[PDB]
Design a binder for this molecule. Structure first.
Ligand SMILES: NC(=O)C1=CN([C@@H]2O[C@H](COP(=O)(O)OP(=O)(O)OC[C@H]3O[C@@H](n4cnc5c(N)ncnc54)[C@H](OP(=O)(O)O)[C@@H]3O)[C@@H](O)[C@H]2O)C=CC1
Ligand SMILES: NC(=O)C1=CN([C@@H]2O[C@H](COP(=O)(O)OP(=O)(O)OC[C@H]3O[C@@H](n4cnc5c(N)ncnc54)[C@H](OP(=O)(O)O)[C@@H]3O)[C@@H](O)[C@H]2O)C=CC1
Ligand SMILES: Cc1ccc(CCCN(O)C(=O)CC[C@@H](c2ccccc2)P(=O)(O)O)cc1
Ligand SMILES: Cc1ccc(CCCN(O)C(=O)CC[C@@H](c2ccccc2)P(=O)(O)O)cc1
Ligand SMILES: [Ca+2]
Ligand SMILES: [Ca+2]
Ligand SMILES: [Ca+2]
Ligand SMILES: [Mn+2]
Ligand SMILES: [Mn+2]
Lengths: 408, 408
């Protein structure tokens, strides 16, 4: 009866939100068993989680805090977890028959490795890490075609919204990333909603001057805050939409909805549009990823639409947010351009965060790396294709850094 | 896999809209066969439709234009339709094995009769007539339990919206007008959107003196236009929601949404809200009733959310729109109070339309009729129950009229 879940990246924003909603859902019935928690190096925070949830498995990626973990955990009475470390630990958890569903709340390109292994073990993968899809979309499709019982269920709020708007009667006959998913689901077009970020109303002159402090001062982590400010977050999410739902780029429309109530919309072939809405929230997306195709009761505050009162929609200016255009261009180009987009953005975003370049330099760097990249034949076997993605990702990060280094 | 459809009330608003969307859809691919048309007295319109759609059956209710119809139809080359008459024509159409779905576009209290025979013959019934559901909900539920393969599919725009927000793998485990429909679909709450009609900004003093002219001068029939002005249309729709979807009255919220883009919204038990949105429209509601659980291509204009730009929501004032409160009160009392509400409103609406009473007299009369009713032993026998509904309807109409005449 209980859904057996692993939380990968349990100490971060997604991971802690997941454990919060699991905690609430488990107050009376045993709805979920938390079988495994995996983090990078937050050994103290992991220990506190282990004390509460008592998972069968604990894993730390950073082997240097393994002893520290082992020692902390001995303090917990009558608890004999399997304590693992690194890639080998990740792979052992993914292999466990006692795990059904894995929440991937690991950030950056790193989250791809666990995603890949979770699919290879025919698990349900509740994927929040959009960089994996953007970097490796075609590769994940291939894997999902081999590993017949694996599924990716989207957790990113807009993709969760789109997924929810679908009719599960059609969803159940396909799965995310599968060729023909949009046909089977009668999808015509997607309205991909965005907050628009902190700089949405600035003039071109004002935008030239913006700093990371101006973006940082809805409270989110730094990387995503900067991506929201440039709208590269939405750019990545366009490519994410295309891969998840097999929707053509020309049928994905970015819409700025600053109230952030409507989380995205699907237009079906009859032109009817379905949308999903709630307060800005990750608990519903995470919960749904674990309960789908069912829903369960929560005690979340009900949406008060009369109090919200007003919902607004407008088209983003691609002159002001050129990251959006770069994302569409890379996605349409296909091949490894999305990998290059993501990698170069990782560098450009961090340069801006750290006050080393200007706002328009972010898109300039990314553009230059994209223009520099030469298309490669797509390796035909899975393990060569993975190595290739890694090659290009690293190449693009280095190229971005080289561009920055040369031009100051 | 052609969809075989009969249109009942084919020359009316619903009927003609149904043929319109069938016509447009069939231009894209021939999915619909119109097998039967049925009208009251519009023999010439009927002839013209018969010319286009070449239905196997034709039926007119009023015996006195039967021969005229037979005459008219002779003109049509290479066409030998079965031409039928009255209550008896309807019964034969509903019994045909070549008809899968019947659109009931017959208005007022009348529409119940053909609904019943459509259900008795295990058809899919596309039902727009909210008054039948409000007045005879308990009878329809009983019929639908006897006739296991019959289904009512809602066409009323808000109810179609609600229905379209659901997962059909769960819908297919139940059917509308069944107990536990909302439980099985994990429905928590409904937002029932309303235009708000022409009087939302009027003061109490202004409402005291509004006339039917002010109500009438979005173009619809007179009766529904007056109901939209008083918001008794929404009150009837609250009860319609309760019966169609088994949603408790305290879990239906009327919200004024004057732009009429979001057609209504379903809050699930996790507090996720899904909504259906389009331009104000009856084509998609009708078409979906006929395609459910699938959708097909249309050439309808795509919603341009950016252009719509702004969507607003507010709570209706019950002091200004007391008909809403009366509908909830009747719904919550249950029994035959909905039958009484509907019947007395039929009279009060017509009184106001004909300048015989004032705006607040509408709710006054309805209130007084409801107060004079006493709950009745609900017959377990289908035949006795229909007679109860007819008797109570007629009683309530006479009572409303008596209250009008006494004060006037
Ligand atoms: N937060 C949100 O609301 C949203 C998140 N997302 C996406 O979800 C992903 C995760 O985001 P978020 O929760 O914000 O990220 P955080 O930075 O808050 O958390 C990252 C988590 O991953 C762990 N981690 C990092 N590297 C490894 C590794 N090698 N092995 C195991 N665990 C590791 C961290 O461990 P430690 O604590 O030890 O560092 C931490 O638990 C991102 O791709 C993000 O874009 C998208 C939509 C919304
Ligand atoms: N369309 C809309 O926007 C909305 C409609 N509705 C509901 O839909 C229902 C239908 O409304 P609408 O189509 O606008 O109404 P109309 O008055 O425009 O249509 C009436 C139709 O019923 C036919 N009819 C009447 N009596 C008989 C009979 N005894 N036998 C056969 N046919 C008969 C009429 O035939 P004839 O032409 O010969 O008189 C005509 O075809 C209403 O109950 C309303 O509440 C709900 C919400 C909005
Ligand atoms: C504290 C908190 C909690 C939950 C959420 C849910 C939105 C999460 N999400 O999917 C994201 O991609 C974040 C970035 C995007 C966004 C979306 C909504 C609000 C603000 C920003 P955008 O790229 O549109 O600017 C947000 C903020
Ligand atoms: C010609 C045409 C065609 C389609 C529509 C769309 C839906 C109509 N519908 O279901 C009704 O109940 C009508 C009355 C209600 C309404 C709803 C939307 C717009 C305007 C009015 P309300 O009770 O909320 O005032 C409208 C007008
Ligand atoms: Ca150490
Ligand atoms: Ca759904
Ligand atoms: Ca297309
Ligand atoms: Mn997102
Ligand atoms: Mn309606």
């Amino acid at each position: 009866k209980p859904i057996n879940v692993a939380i990968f990246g349990s100490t971060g924003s997604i991971g802690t939100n997941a454990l919060n909603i699991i905690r609430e859902c488990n107050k009376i019935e045993n709805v979920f068993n938390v079988k495994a928690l995996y983090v990078n190096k937050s050994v103290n925070e992991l220990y506190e989680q282990a004390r509460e949830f008592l998972p069968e498995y604990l894993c730390i990626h950073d082997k240097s805090v393994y002893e520290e973990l082992k020692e902390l955990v001995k303090n917990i009475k009558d608890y004999k977890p399997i304590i693992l470390c690194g890639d080998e630990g990740m792979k052992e958890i993914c292999s466990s028959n006692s795990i059904d569903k894995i929440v991937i709340g690991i950030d950056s390109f790193q989250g791809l490795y666990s995603t890949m292994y979770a699919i290879m073990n025919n698990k349900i993968v509740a994927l929040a890490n959009k960089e994996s899809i953007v970097s490796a979309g075609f590769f994940l499709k291939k894997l999902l075609n081999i590993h017949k019982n694996a599924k990716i269920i989207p957790v990113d709020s807009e993709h969760s919204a789109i997924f929810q708007c679908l009719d599960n009667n059609k969803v159940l006959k396909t799965k995310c990333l599968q060729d023909n998913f949009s046909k089977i689901n009668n999808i015509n077009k997607i309205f991909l909603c965005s907050s628009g970020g902190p700089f949405q109303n600035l003039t071109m002159d004002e935008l030239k001057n913006v700093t990371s402090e101006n973006a940082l001062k809805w409270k989110m982590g730094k990387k995503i805050t900067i991506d929201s400010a440039t709208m590269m977050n939405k750019g990545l999410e366009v490519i994410e939409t295309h891969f998840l739902f097999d929707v053509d780029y020309n049928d994905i429309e970015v819409i700025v909805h600053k109230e952030c109530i409507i989380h995205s919309c699907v237009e079906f072939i009859d032109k009817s549009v379905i949308s999903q809405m709630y307060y800005p929230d990750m608990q519903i997306p995470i919960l749904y990823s674990l309960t789908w195709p069912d829903r369960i009761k929560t005690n979340l505050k009900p949406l008060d639409l009369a109090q919200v009162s007003t919902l607004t929609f407008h088209k983003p200016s691609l002159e002001h947010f050129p990251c959006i255009k770069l994302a569409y261009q890379a996605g349409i180009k296909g091949n490894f351009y999305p990998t290059v987009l993501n990698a170069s953005n990782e560098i450009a975003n961090n340069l801006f965060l750290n006050n080393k370049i200007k706002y328009f330099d972010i898109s300039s760097i990314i553009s230059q790396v994209l223009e520099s990249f030469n298309s490669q034949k797509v390796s035909e076997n899975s393990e060569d294709l993975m190595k290739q993605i890694l090659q290009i990702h690293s190449w693009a990060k280095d190229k971005a850094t080289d561009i920055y280094n040369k031009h100051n």
